[PDB]
From a paper:
The main effector of the Psp system is PspA, a 25 kDa protein consisting of six α-helices connected by short loops and an elongated hairpin, where the N-terminal helix α0 of the protein remains unfolded in the absence of membranes. Here, we show that rods of bacterial ESCRT-III protein PspA internalize and thin membrane tubules by overcoming the required bending energy through progressive membrane binding of the N-terminal helix in the PspA assembly.
For the truncated PspA α1-5 sample, the total diameter distribution was narrower and ranged from 235 to 290 Å, with two maxima at 255 Å and 275 Å that were closer but not identical to the apo distribution of WT PspA. None of these structures contained any additional lipid density in the rod lumen. Although the PspA mutant lacking helix α0 shows no structural alterations in the helical rod structure, it can no longer tubulate EPL membranes. In support of this analysis, when we abolished the α0–membrane interaction by removing helix α0 lacking this binding energy contribution, we did not observe any membrane internalization in the lumen of the PspA (α1-α5) rods in the cryo-EM images. Interestingly, when the protein was reconstituted in the presence of membranes, the ATPase activity was increased by ~210%, while the activity of PspA α1-5 was not affected in the presence of membranes.
Residue numbers in the entry:
A (entry chain B): 24 to 56
B (entry chain A), F (entry chain w): 113 to 168
C (entry chain C), E (entry chain y): 57 to 112
D (entry chain v): 169 to 217
């Protein structure tokens, strides 16, 4: 049922967003050092 | 002479080792950024793209 | 959706209401930049208003 | 060094999760703040005088 | 919520009432700093007053 | 000579030992401060942040 996919796909997107969210700080971390 | 010259190699080598470590995370971080950003737009293309948007 | 449109215009309204003082006293440059920021919210505001009407 | 690096990691996150206000707003409030004190004080010097 | 707004203005009022003497005798510098402290309370006071009205 | 030189090592070493201890708590305290402050804003972001505020 495509409807469940819509919700599921965004959930997978949310994990990547936080994954990218954490990654940016790592770049900032080395910059300060 | 041997002890003096060999130390210079060690003195120079150690400086290079940490220098590579500094760039290790820098390139790793950039790779992860693109990797994370690579998929999200692919989902949007598979989700929203008017050609074959699964969403609309 | 209606609430967001009202909120966004208020943000521009505060900039617009603030922009009245920024332009005041002849300090045009402050007003110049302020209105440029407003246009970003204005474009978003128009899109929502169209969405509200069709949803009716 | 290893401990202090972790400090930056936590430090770097706060700005990301709480984006600092742009330098725009700083000058506007500072520009407005002087008028707030001066305009209010303009009455202060005027009411007493 | 109403009580807090009244209390905060009183704090500024005491500074304002005090500021009358601070500005008095020509000691402007004391008054200059005093009013700067007041603005912090004034900003808080305005926010509450708006909250009181909508709650009505 | 041996007893004199060895004491100098002990005399110097002991001074360093307490010096490290002084910085031990200093860095530990800073770490705890950030650790405590790290989570509270995360809760606020999870609680108040207009994007997906669980509160409002």
């Amino acid at each position: 049922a495509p409807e469940d996919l819509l919700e599921r796909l965004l959930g997978e997107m949310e994990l990547e967003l936080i994954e990218l969210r954490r990654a940016l700080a790592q770049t900032i971390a080395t910059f300060k050092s | 002479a041997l002890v003096e010259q060999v130390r210079g190699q060690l003195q120079k080598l150690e400086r290079k080792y940490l220098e590579l470590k500094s760039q290790k995370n820098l390139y790793l971080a950039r790779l992860k950024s693109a990797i994370a950003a690579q998929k999200i737009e692919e989902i949007a293309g598979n989700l929203d793209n008017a050609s074959a948007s699964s969403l609309f | 959706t209606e609430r967001q449109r009202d909120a966004q215009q208020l943000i521009a309204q505060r900039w617009y209401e603030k922009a009245q003082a920024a332009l005041d006293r002849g300090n045009e440059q402050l007003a110049r930049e302020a209105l440029g920021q407003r246009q970003s919210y204005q474009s978003h505001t128009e899109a929502l208003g169209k969405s509200l009407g069709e949803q009716r | 060094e290893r401990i202090e690096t972790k400090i930056l990691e936590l430090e770097a996150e706060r700005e990301l999760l709480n984006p600092p206000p742009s330098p725009l707003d700083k000058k506007f409030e500072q520009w407005e703040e002087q008028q707030a004190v001066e305009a209010t004080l303009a009455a202060m010097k005027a009411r007493r005088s």
